[PDB]
Design an enzyme around this catalytic site. Sequence first.
Site, short mmCIF file in Angstrom:
data_model
loop_
_atom_site.label_atom_id
_atom_site.label_comp_id
_atom_site.label_asym_id
_atom_site.label_seq_id
_atom_site.Cartn_x
_atom_site.Cartn_y
_atom_site.Cartn_z
N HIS A 61 0.83 -1.20 0.00
CA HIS A 61 0.00 0.00 0.00
C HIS A 61 0.86 1.25 0.00
O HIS A 61 0.42 2.32 -0.40
CB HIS A 61 -0.98 0.00 1.18
CG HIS A 61 -0.33 -0.07 2.53
ND1 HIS A 61 0.27 1.02 3.12
CD2 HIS A 61 -0.21 -1.09 3.41
CE1 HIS A 61 0.73 0.68 4.31
NE2 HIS A 61 0.45 -0.60 4.51
N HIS A 91 6.42 7.01 6.05
CA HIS A 91 5.94 6.58 4.76
C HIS A 91 5.24 7.75 4.12
O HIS A 91 5.06 8.79 4.75
CB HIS A 91 4.94 5.44 4.93
CG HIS A 91 3.76 5.81 5.77
ND1 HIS A 91 3.76 5.68 7.14
CD2 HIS A 91 2.57 6.36 5.44
CE1 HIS A 91 2.62 6.14 7.62
NE2 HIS A 91 1.88 6.56 6.61
N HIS A 93 2.04 9.11 1.14
CA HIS A 93 0.76 8.90 0.49
C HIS A 93 0.90 9.84 -0.71
O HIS A 93 1.31 10.98 -0.54
CB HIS A 93 -0.39 9.37 1.37
CG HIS A 93 -0.55 8.56 2.62
ND1 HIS A 93 -1.25 7.37 2.65
CD2 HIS A 93 -0.06 8.75 3.86
CE1 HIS A 93 -1.19 6.86 3.87
NE2 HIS A 93 -0.47 7.67 4.62
N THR A 195 -4.32 6.61 9.38
CA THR A 195 -5.15 6.77 8.19
C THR A 195 -5.26 5.51 7.35
O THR A 195 -5.84 5.52 6.27
CB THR A 195 -4.64 7.90 7.29
OG1 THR A 195 -3.35 7.56 6.79
CG2 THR A 195 -4.57 9.21 8.07
N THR A 196 -4.69 4.43 7.86
CA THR A 196 -4.75 3.14 7.18
C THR A 196 -5.26 2.15 8.21
O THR A 196 -5.03 2.31 9.40
CB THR A 196 -3.38 2.65 6.71
OG1 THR A 196 -2.48 2.64 7.83
CG2 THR A 196 -2.83 3.53 5.61
N1 LIG Z 1 -1.88 -3.79 7.00
C1 LIG Z 1 -0.66 -3.35 7.67
C2 LIG Z 1 -0.77 -1.87 8.03
C3 LIG Z 1 0.53 -1.24 8.46
C4 LIG Z 1 1.12 -0.24 7.70
C5 LIG Z 1 2.32 0.34 8.08
C6 LIG Z 1 2.96 -0.09 9.24
C7 LIG Z 1 2.39 -1.09 10.02
C8 LIG Z 1 1.18 -1.66 9.63
C9 LIG Z 1 -0.43 -4.18 8.93
O1 LIG Z 1 -0.21 -5.39 8.87
O2 LIG Z 1 -0.01 -3.52 9.76
ZN LIG Z 2 0.17 7.73 6.61
#
Ligand SMILES: N[C@@H](Cc1ccccc1)C(=O)O
Ligand SMILES: [Zn+2]
Length: 257
Positions: A61, A91, A93, A195-196
């Site tokens: 992602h 990270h 976006h 936000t995820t």
């Molecule tokens: N889906 C991911 C989301 C995530 C993103 C970035 C860092 C940590 C987690 C998870 O297993 O965590």
């Molecule tokens: Zn973010």
Amino acid sequence: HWGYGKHNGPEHWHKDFPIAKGERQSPVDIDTHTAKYDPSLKPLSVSYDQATSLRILNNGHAFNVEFDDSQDKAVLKGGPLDGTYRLIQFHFHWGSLDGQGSEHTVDKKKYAAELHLVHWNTKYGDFGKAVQQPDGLAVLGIFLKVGSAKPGLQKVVDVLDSIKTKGKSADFTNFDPRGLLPESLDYWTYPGSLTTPPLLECVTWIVLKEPISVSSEQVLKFRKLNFNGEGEPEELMVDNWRPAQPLKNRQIKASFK
Ligand SMILES: N[C@@H](Cc1ccccc1)C(=O)O
Ligand SMILES: [Zn+2]
Ligand SMILES: [Hg+2]
């Protein structure tokens, strides 16, 4: 699996993560004329001098630049924060076009991308326990606009070819996060969430007003990454941003007048 497409994007997240429609979800639109300067806010302190990056990972992602948080090396404190928050990873976006990509917006304005430096409150021992607390995290958000290149970002850009697909990681040591910061630390702050998914509401957001500029070439490199894994149909990693969410019962404070 959640994603950013039509069938697994932001509009679908609430099904697996009900908190998506919570009371303190992020991102949000920052209405500059509604945000109030807060005199009680102490100066913001970003101490990344001892930061120790370890690896860069394409998680399907976005890509995470991870840091060693076994000690207070890279911390954030001051401002709206009580105590010390340790940098664990950062990270971005970004969009498929320069006209979109950021998650937070300023007076509805969307930037080309947004950088998120994630930190956890040290009084909770670790990240896992921190994300179980209302004040467990502090995320420093920085907007990216397309213009001049950002030197401190090129090292990240040049390693993306080695982690083009989901699951790939590469040794990413000695990266200095200080090279991703704008001049001013003026910011807006409000209580929010990741936000995820899982969209945990443990974040004190600190969004810098001054965006950093990156070159078209640099952002274009971000857009060459894949959401898919090696050997699978290519789906460019673009538009991995969540749209602004309801502010609800929240007040955005400005650290400046
Ligand atoms: N889906 C991911 C989301 C995530 C993103 C970035 C860092 C940590 C987690 C998870 O297993 O965590
Ligand atoms: Zn973010
Ligand atoms: Hg929380």
